[model samples]
Target: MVLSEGEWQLVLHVWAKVEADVAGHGQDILIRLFKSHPETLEKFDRFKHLKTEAEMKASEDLKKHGVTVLTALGAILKKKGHHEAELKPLAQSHATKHKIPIKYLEFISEAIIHVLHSRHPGNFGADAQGAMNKALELFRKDIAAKYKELGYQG
Candidate 1:
């Protein structure tokens, strides 16, 4: 899942467009994630009753959380190779503490891809999309491993 320089360029390029407005597209990401995996909504009490991206974005708590999630993603990408070390605690929080399946991260992966593409139109090409998917898949792999190691069957 090593991203080629070209692919990183692709990621950074598209991200810059929406990074300034994480509240906008990030909500879209979660909305997309929730739509893809509705069961995931049950894991989030804040979002459990929300049906639309706009509705989720309207809540101050939801707004902050959207920023937090996007912020964590920025950190993961910035840290690059050792991102799992960055993601481990989050896995524990979700799986070990919250009784959520680490596999649920896949729903978020789709969220990222959808946001990247939806925000950028055709600018995010296949190579870029492939790279993003691979990077996210790596996150999923490490997160799931941490979940299992913690003996969290949830």
Candidate 2:
């Protein structure tokens, strides 16, 4: 993903909400994903049993995880092409410990784009949209490559 200076700035601006950690926007993305695809919840042992939205809201782990995830996003945006080393451990864990199917990672960019679009309709300038899409594609591809290194059959 080749983000021009303006596009990079745009991505950074949008990421401010996510960096707020305790702010609800990051959690909102996770909530939307869980709502739209209940199966995604089953992949998380800690969350699979929590069938109600209220439970998801109440779980302290959810807040911690949502923040951590957004933090990782911040890292990814800052270090796109040069991130394999920094993120390899994450990919290894997801592949080895979680047995995440590689196919699952591919849907994330679209899923996130959908959530961002829904959250702020017409907010992303054309350049930002292109940058974000490209950023996520690069981000997704990076993870998938790590998965491949781990002999990910899925």
Candidate 3:
């Protein structure tokens, strides 16, 4: 694992606190991603047609996808960062099938951090943020490497 034992412990602790509402957190993160960078919305066929914040907020597909995302993330954490086996195929599909840009992939990490901080200002302080970032950095680098290997640039 990229994170030290200390970092991993903090990450798991914070995640457990949010576990009960992880689905909502996931949805908020995606909404935050699109809201912060509207260009990212263009990459999502299911959400691109959403004309307003209200429309996006009310999207069932978006909700389900968000839950799926957090479910995958939760599973990864359960495996203690053994993401390479799972995320590689995801990166391959995203690079070739989804044609998602690497920047947006990076943006999702930012969205996750931002939403966590927004929701748990007291709990997600610098220490937690640092630990979270360290864990996510591995995710970002691995995906980027997979994207590059597939000749998917930018």
Candidate 4:
């Protein structure tokens, strides 16, 4: 699907938010998104069943890594002119390691954005697109850096 730049940004914003807690806030967002975009439910189901407490606890270690990467990316973004140069490689590696399609990231992003916008309708506006893009770029960078720390070079 050819998502517009604005749409992509929205997707990215949502993706970062959920990566924070895939089984908590993430599940809520996914449920709402599937309600609106039922077709995407097929994809949603792939990850939704894993939202159990056991699954969440089992992934706690990885979640900590995610948090570290996100913090690092935030710091980098605070510096001048930081772009998402590091995220592509990270996604490539993660996709390979997890056996997930790179395109799944796009779907995940879209689901999150749909939920966020619905939850905070007035909070997001025309500028939301730009904000989301920058956020996504930073998020990708963080993911890449974290993957490197894990000795992933893909």
The numbered model that scores best in lDDT is 3
Q: List the residue pairs that clash in candidate 4.
A: none
C-alpha TM-scores of all predictions: 0.85, 0.85, 0.91, 0.42
The residue-by-residue lDDT of candidate 1 on 1-154, one tens digit each, is 5767776777667667768798877677877787788888898876699877677667787778888989888887766657867877887788766787656777678778887887777767887788778777777777777777888744
The global C-alpha lDDT for each of the candidates, from Candidate 1 onward, is: 0.76, 0.73, 0.82, 0.50
lDDT, residue 148, candidate 2: 82
Taking the tens digit of each residue's C-alpha lDDT, what string does model 3 give over 21-78?
9768877998888888999888788788988778878998998899888887777766
* lDDT for 123 (candidate 2): 60
Q: Residue 141 in model 3: shift from native, Å?
A: 0.6
Instruction: Compute the lDDT for candidate 2.
Output: 0.73
Ranking by lDDT: 3, 1, 2, 4
Error of 3 at 94 (Å): 0.8
- Name the Cα RMSD for model 4: 8.6
List candidate 2 stretches off by more than 4 Å: 21-23, 120-123
Off by over 4 Å in 3: none
* Per-model C-alpha RMSD: 2.1, 2.2, 1.6, 8.6
Per-residue lDDT tens digits of candidate 4, residues 1-154? 1335555555455445545664454445444444555544454334444444456445544355445544544444443233446455545556555644434445555654565566555545656755665555545445545555655533
